[PDB]
Design an enzyme around this catalytic site. Structure first.
Site, short mmCIF file in Angstrom:
data_model
loop_
_atom_site.label_atom_id
_atom_site.label_comp_id
_atom_site.label_asym_id
_atom_site.label_seq_id
_atom_site.Cartn_x
_atom_site.Cartn_y
_atom_site.Cartn_z
N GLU A 209 0.79 -1.23 0.00
CA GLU A 209 0.00 0.00 0.00
C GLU A 209 0.82 1.27 0.00
OE1 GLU A 209 -3.78 0.28 2.55
OE2 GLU A 209 -2.77 2.24 2.78
N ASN B 20 12.28 1.56 -3.10
CA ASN B 20 11.88 0.21 -2.77
C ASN B 20 12.68 -0.83 -3.54
OD1 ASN B 20 8.82 -0.29 -1.18
ND2 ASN B 20 9.80 1.72 -1.40
#
Ligand SMILES: *[C@@H]1O[C@H](CO)[C@@H](O[C@@H]2O[C@H](CO)[C@@H](O)[C@H](O)[C@H]2NC(C)=O)[C@H](O)[C@H]1NC(C)=O
Ligand code: NAG
EC number: 3.2.1.45
Length: 495
Positions: A338, A368
């Site tokens: 999310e 990420n």
């Protein structure tokens, strides 16, 4: 191909307007050895424009050089996508059918940005217009009156089927609960500080574990199977006095024991045993502690396939969380389940055309990738201009904004920033090394497509053009330049 219809709403960039008869689109992917493909998006209006250039055999000079490291192998990629919340499905289906298809095409088709993940809530969360679980009859320990409401049978599921039909990539479904039925909870409410009654191994905990199974059973009845489930959306929320919407509190020890004792065995002894379980599904700031608590107990670890993480894009270290965690449990994938923006008090929940929110998405996607994360899932697939609906008024932004009164939708910069990753990095892609010849302001990540060819994303969040070259020893040198306020995906074949 169909180009962006641009429209300004007073912010730094434009949105692309789509409606029942028009929407920007791609031609089908096509480049010969020795050439490279470049997709460009700019704050000034360029939207994933395709261009090609040659790969040079030689390179003179001392400007920025990014060298590809084919042989430094990092994580493999699961994929990219968003959440089919009640609010998103509600908005999508309020448009006319032809517009609905363009919207689904933009996300799920090779003519769009090729999403291959869908997160599906189990029952209501805050992007729902009413609270409900699948088992609202009180004390129904056997779950005799477990059923899917219309939110699943008439909105989410049909929409999911159509996405799958439209996708060429195989798509994976991910499910997460916000709250259990209220009679399973110490506080007897959908929200607020409160957890499962009693203790792991007991009948409240067994009932909840079976509820996952019943969920999967009901979905399997509409011919959908899940790739993974989370143990609980933001377990940490339910520990907080007055938490405003649907939640179920777990301490890490509670989650550990619940997984070991109930949810793991229950899932394992069912026909859904190949479904993966992810733990955490919460802010990365709970790492590495949560991981330590759960994974250093072999009885819990044997069931946990990965660790799901959330990002509040408005706020913002990663190495001391993602980094440390990966170090400690290298074989337990990190997955971003999310992300989102729209809460900075001073700014609207939805800023139509916001290049900054765009930059924030890909910057985060890149951070990420740089820290081993194997996949990325946006929050609401679509939202209205207010940023909802949301029964607690907890509005935020979405990459596609639906305007029902004009049978129109808008594709925000965010959408395209996602696209620069999702469209070109299929499941199986592997992140590999990319070292820079000197401090610069670019953000960049390099991966190898399963077929062997190369993807590199370069993001430029400064206002200055940055000239640069990319070395790949297999083929040569890409001379290129990175325009201020732009993001490029570069593709080139390797043999
Ligand atoms: C859907 O949007 C399209 C694209 O903007 C609209 O088609 C344009 O319409 C105007 C007015 O008719 C023309 O000047 C443009 O040449 C059209 N562009 C194209 C490629 O057709 C269309 O009006 C929109 N549909 C609705 C119902 O508003
Ligand atoms: C629960 O289900 C039973 C039979 O399955 C049905 O007759 C009844 O109406 C339901 N009870 C409630 C409280 O809805």
């Amino acid at each position: 191909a169909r180009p962006c219809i641009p429209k300004s709403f007073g912010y730094s960039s434009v949105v692309c307007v789509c409606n029942a008869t028009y929407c920007d689109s791609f031609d089908p992917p096509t480049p010969a050895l020795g050439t490279f493909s470049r997709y460009e998006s700019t704050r000034s209006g360029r939207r994933m424009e395709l261009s090609m250039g040659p790969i040079q055999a030689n390179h003179t000079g001392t400007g920025l050089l990014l060298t590809l490291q084919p042989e430094q192998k990092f994580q493999k990629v699961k994929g990219f996508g968003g959440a089919m919340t009640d609010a998103a499905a509600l908005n999508i289906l309020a448009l006319s059918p032809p517009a609905q298809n363009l919207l689904l095409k933009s996300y799920f088709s090779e003519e769009g940005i090729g999403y291959n993940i869908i997160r599906v809530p189990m029952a209501s969360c805050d992007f729902s217009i009413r609270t409900y679980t699948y088992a609202d009859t009180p004390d129904d320990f056997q779950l005799h009156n477990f059923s899917l409401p219309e939110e699943d049978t008439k909105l989410k599921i049909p929409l999911i089927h159509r996405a799958l039909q439209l996708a060429q990539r195989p798509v994976s479904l991910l499910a997460s609960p916000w709250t259990s039925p209220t009679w399973l909870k110490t506080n007897g409410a959908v929200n607020g500080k409160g957890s499962l009654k009693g203790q792991p191994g007991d009948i409240y905990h067994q009932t909840w574990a079976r509820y996952f199974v019943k969920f999967l059973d009901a979905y399997a009845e509409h011919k959908l199977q899940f790739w993974a489930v989370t143990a609980e959306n933001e377990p940490s929320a339910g520990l907080l006095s007055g938490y405003p919407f649907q939640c179920l509190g777990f301490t890490p020890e509670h989650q550990r024991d619940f997984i070991a004792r109930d949810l793991g065995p229950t899932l394992a002894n069912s026909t859904h045993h190949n479904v993966r379980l992810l733990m955490l599904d919460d802010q990365r700031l709970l790492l590495p502690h949560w991981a330590k608590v759960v994974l250093t107990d072999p009885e819990a670890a044997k069931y946990v396939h990965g660790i799901a993480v959330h990002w509040y894009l408005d706020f913002l270290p990663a190495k001391a969380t993602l980094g440390e965690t990966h170090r400690l449990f290298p074989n337990t994938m990190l997955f971003a389940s999310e992300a989102c923006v729209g809460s900075k008090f001073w700014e609207q929940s939805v800023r139509l055309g916001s290049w900054d929110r765009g930059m924030q998405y890909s910057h985060s996607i890149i951070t990420n990738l740089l820290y081993h994360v194997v996949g990325w899932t946006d929050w609401n697939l679509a939202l209205n201009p207010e940023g909802g609906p949301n029964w607690v008024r907890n509005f935020v932004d979405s990459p596609i904004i639906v305007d029902i009164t004009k049978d129109t939708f808008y594709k925000q910069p965010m959408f395209y920033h996602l696209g620069h990753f999702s469209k070109f990095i299929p499941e199986g892609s592997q992140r590999v090394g990319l070292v820079a010849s000197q401090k610069n302001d670019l953000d960049a990540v390099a991966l190898m497509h399963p077929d062997g060819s190369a993807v590199v994303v370069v993001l430029n969040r400064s206002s200055k053009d940055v000239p640069l070259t990319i070395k790949d020893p297999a083929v040569g040198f890409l001379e290129t330049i990175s325009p201020g306020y732009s993001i490029h995906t570069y593709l080139w074949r390797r043999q």
